[PDB]
Ligand binder design. Structure first.
Ligand SMILES: *[C@@H]1O[C@H](CO)[C@@H](O[C@@H]2O[C@H](CO)[C@@H](O)[C@H](O)[C@H]2NC(C)=O)[C@H](O)[C@H]1NC(C)=O
Ligand SMILES: *[C@@H]1O[C@H](CO)[C@@H](O[C@@H]2O[C@H](CO)[C@@H](O)[C@H](O)[C@H]2NC(C)=O)[C@H](O)[C@H]1NC(C)=O
Ligand SMILES: *[C@@H]1O[C@H](CO)[C@@H](O)[C@H](O)[C@H]1NC(C)=O
Ligand SMILES: *[C@@H]1O[C@H](CO)[C@@H](O)[C@H](O)[C@H]1NC(C)=O
Length: 288
């Protein structure tokens, strides 16, 4: 259970489909993976020791993507899918460009980040939305942070052209609710992978994003004043045979040594707390 409202409680079984897939690759940041750009600041032809919310070198990712057709498992909405959100998380999300009847699409899972997922708290929801404008497929990314009455079994659905045996249903507030924040963000539907930093500090939530390269740019920030404790990558139901990936590794507060081209491109990094070599390599930045 995520919310605590028995919504459209049909086509649900208790089927064990296993546990989120572990990546064969670990976090290695030795040229950018897991780093972000500084908001309203651009460094050229220089290194820079920097504290921040970075993923842990040697840590694996987990594929939190859940793909359904009609049936949802009750086990999909518990640990280990309903996961702890501490400092933050880093996401490598695949843009599933399923090709059907000539046209190419752009599906990937929604993620909700909250405390209790009840209308008494706020919950962040980062949901993709696709639509055609004269047969050209457009990418949106509907961010919203609201006092949602979340369902026990929240799921999104794919584009209706790919076929759906379920209606989209994650919250039941067809009555208009109190929201701290909501705006849409366009993304390039021709992107191989989308990357996200989601972290919190002193009651403020932070989001970084990129649909080009792996190094994320700043997206938005929002003062909650509360402390976020959980994330859930929602199952996406579809008739078409999509191949979903939402790869997540957690963030902790760490010092990194970053490096920039003359064109301001972060091209190299050192996980400074990973290694006795790395520690030595950073601390030696004070005038020798
Ligand atoms: C806030 O959420 C709670 C549950 O988290 C809702 O309570 C349910 O209300 C319906 C009436 O429509 C009852 O049939 C259920 O038994 C209630 N459930 C529980 C667990 O109490 C409540 O309606 C929501 N209210 C608003 C305004 O969003
Ligand atoms: C984000 O874009 C979507 C594009 O559909 C907007 O959602 C629709 O808003 C209209 C109101 O003009 C409603 O009639 C539709 O029911 C909405 N559709 C969906 C799928 O939610 C939305 O307005 C945009 N959000 C923001 C914050 O601008
Ligand atoms: C309720 O859910 C079932 C299966 O998920 C679906 O067939 C039906 O159309 C849904 N209807 C409404 C109004 O939610
Ligand atoms: C970059 O900085 C170095 C010194 O570390 C300097 O010699 C060089 O002129 C600079 N190159 C560019 C491309 O800015």
């Amino acid at each position: 259970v995520i919310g605590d409202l028995k919504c459209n409680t049909s086509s649900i079984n208790d089927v064990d489909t296993g546990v989120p897939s572990i990546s064969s690759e670990v976090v290695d940041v030795t040229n950018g993976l897991g780093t972000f750009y500084v908001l309203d600041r651009v460094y050229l032809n220089t290194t820079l020791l920097l504290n921040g919310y970075y993923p842990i070198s040697g840590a694996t990712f987990r594929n939190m993507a859940l793909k359904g057709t009609r049936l949802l498992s009750t086990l999909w909405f518990k640990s280990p899918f309903l996961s702890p959100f501490n400092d933050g998380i880093f996401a490598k999300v695949k843009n599933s460009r399923f090709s059907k009847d000539g046209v190419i699409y752009s599906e990937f899972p929604a993620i909700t980040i909250g405390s209790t997922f009840v209308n008494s708290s706020h919950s962040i929801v980062v949901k993709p939305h696709t639509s055609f404008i004269n047969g050209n497929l457009q990418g949106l990314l509907q961010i919203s942070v609201c006092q949602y009455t979340m369902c026990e079994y929240p799921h999104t659905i794919c584009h209706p052209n790919l076929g759906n045996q379920r209606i989209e249903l994650w919250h039941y507030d067809t009555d208009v609710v109190s929201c701290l924040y909501k705006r849409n963000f366009t993304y390039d539907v021709n992107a191989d992978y989308l990357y996200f930093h989601f972290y919190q500090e002193g009651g403020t939530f932070y989001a970084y994003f990129t649909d080009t390269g792996f190094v994320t740019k700043f997206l938005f920030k929002l003062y909650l004043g509360t402390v976020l404790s959980h994330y859930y990558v929602m199952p996406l139901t579809c008739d078409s045979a999509l191949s979903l990936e939402y790869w997540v590794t957690p963030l902790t507060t760490r010092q990194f040594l970053l490096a920039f081209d003359q064109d301001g491109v972060l091209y190299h990094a050192v996980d400074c707390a990973s290694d006795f070599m790395s520690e030595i390599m950073c601390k030696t930045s004070s005038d020798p």
